[PDB]
Design a protein around this motif. Structure first.
Motif, PDB file in Angstrom:
ATOM      1  N   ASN A  43      -8.125   0.944   8.444  1.00 20.89           N
ATOM      2  CA  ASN A  43      -7.427   1.339   9.879  1.00 20.89           C
ATOM      3  C   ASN A  43      -7.655   2.307  10.432  1.00 20.89           C
ATOM      4  N   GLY A  44      -8.528   3.331   9.860  1.00 21.85           N
ATOM      5  CA  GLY A  44      -8.995   4.528  10.712  1.00 21.85           C
ATOM      6  C   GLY A  44      -8.370   5.787   9.739  1.00 21.85           C
ATOM      7  N   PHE A  45      -7.120   5.843   9.280  1.00 20.90           N
ATOM      8  CA  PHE A  45      -7.060   6.874   8.328  1.00 20.90           C
ATOM      9  C   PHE A  45      -7.790   6.857   7.131  1.00 20.90           C
ATOM     10  N   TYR A  46      -8.181   8.259   6.932  1.00 23.53           N
ATOM     11  CA  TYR A  46      -9.447   8.414   5.839  1.00 23.53           C
ATOM     12  C   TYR A  46      -8.575   8.147   4.459  1.00 23.53           C
ATOM     13  N   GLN A  47      -9.359   7.521   3.609  1.00 27.23           N
ATOM     14  CA  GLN A  47      -8.831   7.111   2.533  1.00 27.23           C
ATOM     15  C   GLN A  47     -10.113   6.996   1.378  1.00 27.23           C
ATOM     16  N   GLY A  48     -11.059   7.621   1.626  1.00 23.73           N
ATOM     17  CA  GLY A  48     -12.438   7.708   0.713  1.00 23.73           C
ATOM     18  C   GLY A  48     -13.394   6.891   1.193  1.00 23.73           C
TER      19      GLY A  48
ATOM     20  N   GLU B 261     -16.349   3.869   0.762  1.00 18.18           N
ATOM     21  CA  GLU B 261     -16.386   2.346   0.837  1.00 18.18           C
ATOM     22  C   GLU B 261     -16.141   2.201  -0.680  1.00 18.18           C
ATOM     23  N   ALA B 262     -16.785   2.844  -1.722  1.00 12.70           N
ATOM     24  CA  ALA B 262     -16.706   2.713  -3.126  1.00 12.70           C
ATOM     25  C   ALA B 262     -15.491   2.787  -3.708  1.00 12.70           C
ATOM     26  N   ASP B 263     -14.546   3.815  -3.095  1.00 10.72           N
ATOM     27  CA  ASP B 263     -13.377   4.493  -3.526  1.00 10.72           C
ATOM     28  C   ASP B 263     -12.353   3.496  -3.148  1.00 10.72           C
ATOM     29  N   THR B 264     -12.573   3.028  -1.895  1.00 14.51           N
ATOM     30  CA  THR B 264     -11.491   1.961  -1.377  1.00 14.51           C
ATOM     31  C   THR B 264     -11.622   0.589  -1.911  1.00 14.51           C
ATOM     32  N   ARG B 265     -12.642   0.320  -2.258  1.00 14.45           N
ATOM     33  CA  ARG B 265     -13.132  -0.912  -2.968  1.00 14.45           C
ATOM     34  C   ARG B 265     -12.466  -0.874  -4.398  1.00 14.45           C
ATOM     35  N   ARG B 266     -12.849   0.215  -5.103  1.00  7.78           N
ATOM     36  CA  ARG B 266     -12.221   0.525  -6.537  1.00  7.78           C
ATOM     37  C   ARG B 266     -10.728   0.338  -6.507  1.00  7.78           C
ATOM     38  N   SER B 267     -10.082   1.127  -5.312  1.00  7.15           N
ATOM     39  CA  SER B 267      -8.643   1.028  -5.209  1.00  7.15           C
ATOM     40  C   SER B 267      -8.187  -0.329  -4.901  1.00  7.15           C
ATOM     41  N   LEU B 268      -8.809  -1.208  -4.175  1.00 11.17           N
ATOM     42  CA  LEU B 268      -8.363  -2.505  -4.092  1.00 11.17           C
ATOM     43  C   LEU B 268      -8.272  -3.322  -5.133  1.00 11.17           C
TER      44      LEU B 268
ATOM     45  N   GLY C  38       0.867  -1.174   0.074  1.00 10.35           N
ATOM     46  CA  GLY C  38       0.138   0.051   0.194  1.00 10.35           C
ATOM     47  C   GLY C  38       0.955   1.343  -0.080  1.00 10.35           C
ATOM     48  N   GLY C  39       0.234   2.364  -0.634  1.00 12.93           N
ATOM     49  CA  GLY C  39       1.056   3.565  -0.647  1.00 12.93           C
ATOM     50  C   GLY C  39       2.502   3.478  -1.386  1.00 12.93           C
ATOM     51  N   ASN C  40       3.371   4.236  -0.665  1.00 11.14           N
ATOM     52  CA  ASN C  40       4.705   4.242  -1.392  1.00 11.14           C
ATOM     53  C   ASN C  40       5.692   4.880  -0.173  1.00 11.14           C
ATOM     54  N   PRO C  41       6.991   4.821  -0.280  1.00  9.39           N
ATOM     55  CA  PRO C  41       7.937   5.052   0.721  1.00  9.39           C
ATOM     56  C   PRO C  41       7.952   6.531   0.876  1.00  9.39           C
ATOM     57  N   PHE C  42       7.326   7.421   0.023  1.00  8.52           N
ATOM     58  CA  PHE C  42       7.236   8.615   0.249  1.00  8.52           C
ATOM     59  C   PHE C  42       5.733   9.207   0.737  1.00  8.52           C
ATOM     60  N   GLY C  43       4.575   8.346   0.740  1.00 11.12           N
ATOM     61  CA  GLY C  43       3.550   8.818   1.005  1.00 11.12           C
ATOM     62  C   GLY C  43       3.105   8.522   2.390  1.00 11.12           C
ATOM     63  N   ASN C  44       2.032   8.693   3.142  1.00 11.45           N
ATOM     64  CA  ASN C  44       1.464   8.392   4.210  1.00 11.45           C
ATOM     65  C   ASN C  44       1.615   6.866   4.579  1.00 11.45           C
ATOM     66  N   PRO C  45       2.522   6.865   5.822  1.00  9.68           N
ATOM     67  CA  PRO C  45       2.562   5.321   6.305  1.00  9.68           C
ATOM     68  C   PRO C  45       1.347   4.529   6.552  1.00  9.68           C
ATOM     69  N   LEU C  46       0.206   5.244   6.664  1.00  9.01           N
ATOM     70  CA  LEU C  46      -1.043   4.536   7.103  1.00  9.01           C
ATOM     71  C   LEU C  46      -1.795   4.175   5.856  1.00  9.01           C
ATOM     72  N   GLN C  47      -1.150   4.626   4.533  1.00  5.34           N
ATOM     73  CA  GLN C  47      -2.018   4.082   3.357  1.00  5.34           C
ATOM     74  C   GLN C  47      -1.830   2.709   3.240  1.00  5.34           C
ATOM     75  N   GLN C  48      -3.309   1.985   3.262  1.00  6.00           N
ATOM     76  CA  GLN C  48      -3.476   0.520   3.113  1.00  6.00           C
ATOM     77  C   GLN C  48      -3.496   0.004   1.447  1.00  6.00           C
ATOM     78  N   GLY C  49      -2.832  -1.295   1.544  1.00  7.78           N
ATOM     79  CA  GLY C  49      -2.772  -1.697   0.254  1.00  7.78           C
ATOM     80  C   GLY C  49      -3.534  -3.077   0.208  1.00  7.78           C
TER      81      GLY C  49
END
Ligand SMILES: OC[C@H]1O[C@@H]2O[C@H]3[C@H](O)[C@@H](O)[C@@H](O[C@H]4[C@H](O)[C@@H](O)[C@@H](O[C@H]5[C@H](O)[C@@H](O)[C@@H](O[C@H]6[C@H](O)[C@@H](O)[C@@H](O[C@H]7[C@H](O)[C@@H](O)[C@@H](O[C@H]1[C@H](O)[C@H]2O)O[C@@H]7CO)O[C@@H]6CO)O[C@@H]5CO)O[C@@H]4CO)O[C@@H]3CO
Ligand SMILES: [Ca+2]
Ligand SMILES: [Ca+2]
Length: 866
Positions: free
Chosen positions: A551-556, A558-565, A530-541
């Motif tokens: 995990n709590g950190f706002y990432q959009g 349900e539809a957005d996170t599902r799409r990203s997954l 998830g994310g990258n070495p330069f992004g927010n550490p809490l970004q999930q993959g």
């Protein structure tokens, strides 16, 4: 009086300068010019109308606009390049010489020390030098015994002496003009082609590398003893740091820990560990820099340590540990070693004795010892930058002999520090020669089996390709090594001054496509973690709870996170198929796309390779957070360490069963932690511990050194102090057992290791895709010759088909795959005998082709031929 350098001397008769619509060249041997006066000679330059030749512009693309000026024939170029030079208009500036130096002095003859039954000869390339001599010493610290002048012949200085010169120590005394000081200085420098050094490289040891006394018993029979390798497709890589390996290993006696010698301890815990992975199927071990680098003193009496017993009493989330380590970091025995000084010599600090033959003998013994337990050896080579430059310093050698040549410089003549500091210029002939030569030194004199290139994107492609043919053409009868088996790979990052081919075609990911040279697949790494070495550490993959376990950190929404997954899942699947650019995958939108047609978050092709052997799949390495640490940061805190133990296995399993070449970071298999240190290059033994007693994984040993981690301490502290994050021996062993089994599965069938893109396009298919795909599941099928009259070659004699289900969902799933209905699929024999009670509950139902797989589980199904 120190002018910059905005002019270029590209050829013996051409000078490039970017002035506008009377130009003169000035030369002072003693370097006594000042603002244009005090010169020794003066000559005017006639403006060229035909501009720069194609050869010049192709070698230096970034100056193809510069105006051209012609240098008269009357001008003696060989003499001028030794003097101080400027150019003026009627603005004054100095000249960058690499161009003309190559044009006139490109040398392919013997360099360094040559030995004959009757004599010994020295050769040094220093075209700009006004004088070169050699000082001889009788020992590593003895006084100077003799000084001998060298004669220059075409920019190459030479001298020949009696054979009694052998085993003497020496230094070159070079008389050159340094741009950074605007002076002709007389500096002492080691030999760029040195084969051994005294402690810290203070002196060069005039040793014969072919001397029989430098060879371990049976050294010349190593080619016969090396582990067999049918194809590069069979390769698996295990990245290990030489000191990390034995620094804490109690089974190795105190004195012999932390260096080359530790590998000779066959029966040690550490070696028994490598033997275990080796027997499982692991082919290669990749050692971190083991050449002569700065950062660690070769003199062990200068080493300093922290109180390992005291720090063990401090709180898990305290800042006292790091404060103590940092206090002595500049003087401890630890460092990754990414600070090149001399490329062709084993690191003194890793030897039992910095002075003498021990560093040569022991290195070979390390290579031999690894070969004898089924492991080939790969060196981490760093040709992209130097530790130091300039006239002053024991750590500066190359830039001391030919200032401004070995290092890359900007348009003002200032050195490029992109790679870290003092970038090299592989685009220059003699730099290119030095690199290829060094590689041959290690392949032949030390019988190394492969090379990982640090910052390969900073190296010219032609350098990489010329090296590849030179190494692969080595033969047992002519060199004692089978060159065809040598494998090359590196970091193909494209950035800074080399980006967009500005200094020429570099060894970036896209440029190395179709070269047979591997590159790190950062695409599958980021998609899994998830994310990258330069992004927010809490970004999930994909494998860290994106959408399925927020995990709590706002990432959009349900539809957005599902799409990203789903998006990540597509990248992973392209990477599992060897990260090929032409492989066609049914994307999440339902549309069919080639690997190159799917793009990264910043608009470049995900799949970019022309062969599976060109992709190095991984999810962790020496730099950035360890696998265990990144999972413990990204996943929800509520999760138990038991569940995370499975999450770790999922990650490394995805690598171990992917097409292409799996790459593992030492410790993945045992939940290794650096207490969330994201750049432990300088964090000592404390934060880099490899515990082969399996009692700990080095989690919760205090906050990581503030220099690189302070801004994330608030995020780490609560996790480090939370007792339910700390794994016990039981977990660690379980992780190791399941890791071993997964290796066994990769090497139980050739179907996991297809050798060509054609084979992958034909046999590899994914069964959970489209707009209505089940989230968090990857189903990979690999086909083999079935029934009679097959369009394929029977690659596997045991199975005719293989199915792999990756379930990152917390819950069990049932995947109906009609295409695989009415077949004889069984749980893999290795998983049936697994110590994990969970994976044993995997099932397959024929009538519907339904595969039932538990949560956080990877299940392998096969169809027997018998
Ligand atoms: O180079 C300066 C950098 O040095 C160190 O970073 C290491 C890093 O630890 C390694 O993992 C590796 O990084 C690789 C990546 O693995 C690889 O994916 C790729 O990265 C690309 C990214 O995918 C993409 O996002 C983009 O990065 C941009 C980014 O959007 C910007 O934020 C900016 O990054 C800067 C950082 O914010 C800054 O902290 C610092 O980073 C140091 C760092 O201290 C150290 O750990 O500077 C960078 C650069 O200005 O810019 C980048 C690039 O424009 O693009 C990249 C590349 O296409 O490649 C990187 C290598 O660059 O290696 C680096 C360096 O050895
Ligand atoms: Ca092996
Ligand atoms: Ca250190």
């Amino acid at each position: 009086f120190m002018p910059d350098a905005r002019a270029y001397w590209v050829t013996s008769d051409l000078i490039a300068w970017n002035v506008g619509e009377s130009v003169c060249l000035y030369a002072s041997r003693a370097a006594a010019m000042s603002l244009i006066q005090g010169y020794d000679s003066k000559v005017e330059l006639q403006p060229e109308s035909a501009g720069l030749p194609e050869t010049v512009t192709q070698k230096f693309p970034f100056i193809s606009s510069y105006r051209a000026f012609r240098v008269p024939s009357s001008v003696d170029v060989a003499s001028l390049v030794k003097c101080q030079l400027v150019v003026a208009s009627f603005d004054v500036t100095g000249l960058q010489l690499p161009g003309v130096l190559d044009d006139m002095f490109a040398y392919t003859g013997p360099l360094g020390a040559v030995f004959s039954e009757d004599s010994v000869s020295l050769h040094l390339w220093a075209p700009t030098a006004q004088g070169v001599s050699v000082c001889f010493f009788d020992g590593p610290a003895g006084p100077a015994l003799e000084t001998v002048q060298l004669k220059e012949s075409n920019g190459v200085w030479s001298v020949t002496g009696p054979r009694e010169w052998e085993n003497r120590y020496y230094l070159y005394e070079v008389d050159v003009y340094h741009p950074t000081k605007a002076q002709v200085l007389k500096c002492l420098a080691g030999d760029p082609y040195a084969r051994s050094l005294s402690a810290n490289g203070a002196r060069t040891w005039l040793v014969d590398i072919n001397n029989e006394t430098l060879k371990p018993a049976s050294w010349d029979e190593l080619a016969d003893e090396k582990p067999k390798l049918d194809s590069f497709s069979d390769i698996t890589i295990y990245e290990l740091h030489i000191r990390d390996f034995s620094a804490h290993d109690g089974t190795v006696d105190s004195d012999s820990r932390g260096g080359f010698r530790a590998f000779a301890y066959q029966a040690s815990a550490g070696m028994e560990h490598l033997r275990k992975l080796s027997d499982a199927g692991l082919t290669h071990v990749h050692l971190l820099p083991s050449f002569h680098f700065a950062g660690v003193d070769d003199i062990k009496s200068n080493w300093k340590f922290v109180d390992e017993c005291e720090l063990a009493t401090f709180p898990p989330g305290s800042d006292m540990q790091q404060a103590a380590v940092v206090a002595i970091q500049e003087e401890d025995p630890y460092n990754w070693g990414y600070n090149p000084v001399l490329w062709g010599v084993p690191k003194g600090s890793y030897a039992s004795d910095p002075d003498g033959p021990s560093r040569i003998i022991e290195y070979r013994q390390m290579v031999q010892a690894l070969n004898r337990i089924g492991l080939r050896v790969v060196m981490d080579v760093v040709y992209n930058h130097l530790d130091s430059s300039g006239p002053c310093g024991i750590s500066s050698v190359l830039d001391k002999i030919v200032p401004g040549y070995y290092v890359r410089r900007d348009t003002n003549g200032q050195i490029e520090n992109s790679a870290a500091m003092n970038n090299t210029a592989s685009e220059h002939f003699m730099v290119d020669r030095l690199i290829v030569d060094d590689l041959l030194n290690w392949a032949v004199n030390y019988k190394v089996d492969g090379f990982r290139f640090d910052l390969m994107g900073h190296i010219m492609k032609r350098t990489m390709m010329r090296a590849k043919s030179a190494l692969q053409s080595l033969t047992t009868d002519a060199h004692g090594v089978d060159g065809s088996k040598i494998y090359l790979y590196g970091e193909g990052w494209d950035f800074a001054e080399v980006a967009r081919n500005q200094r020429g075609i570099n060894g970036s990911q896209l440029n190395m496509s179709g070269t047979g040279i591997g590159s790190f697949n950062d695409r599958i790494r980021d998609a899994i973690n998830g994310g990258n070495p330069f992004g927010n550490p809490l970004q999930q993959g994909f494998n860290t709870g994106l959408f399925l376990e927020p995990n709590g950190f706002y990432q959009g929404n349900e539809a957005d996170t599902r799409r990203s997954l789903a998006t990540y899942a597509d990248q992973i699947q392209i990477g599992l198929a060897g990260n090929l650019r032409d492989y066609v995958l049914i994307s999440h939108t339902g549309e069919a796309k080639k690997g190159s047609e799917i793009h990264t978050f910043d608009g470049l092709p995900v799949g970019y390779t022309a062969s599976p052997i060109e992709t190095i799949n991984y999810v962790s390495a020496h730099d950035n957070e360890t696998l265990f640490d990144v999972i413990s940061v990204k996943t929800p805190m509520i999760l138990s360490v038991d569940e995370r133990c499975r999450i770790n296995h999922l990650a490394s399993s995805m690598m171990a069963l992917s097409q292409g070449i799996p790459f593992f970071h030492a410790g993945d298999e045992i939940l290794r932690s650096k207490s969330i240190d994201r750049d432990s290059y300088n964090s000592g033994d404390w934060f880099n511990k490899l515990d082969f007693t399996y009692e700990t994984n080095n989690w919760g040993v205090g906050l990581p050194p503030s220099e690189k981690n302070e801004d994330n301490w608030p995020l780490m502290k609560p996790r480090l102090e939370n007792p339910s994050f700390k794994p016990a021996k039981g977990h660690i062993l379980a992780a190791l057992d399941s890791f071993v089994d997964i290796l066994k599965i990769r090497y139980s069938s050739p179907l996991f290791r297809l050798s060509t893109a054609n084979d992958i396009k034909q046999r590899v298919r994914f069964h959970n895709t489209g707009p209505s795909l089940v989230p968090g599941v990857i189903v990979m099928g690999i086909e083999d010759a079935r029934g009679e009259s097959p369009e394929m070659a029977q690659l596997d004699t045991n199975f005719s088909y293989v199915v792999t289900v990756f379930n990152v969902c917390p819950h069990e799933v049932s995947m109906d795959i009609p295409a695989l209905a009415s077949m004889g699929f069984e749980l893999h024999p290795v998983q049936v005998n697994s110590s994990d009670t969970l994976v044993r509950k995997s099932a397959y139902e024929a009538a519907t082709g339904r595969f039932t797989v538990p949560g956080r589980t990877v299940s392998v199904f096969v169809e027997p031929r018998c």
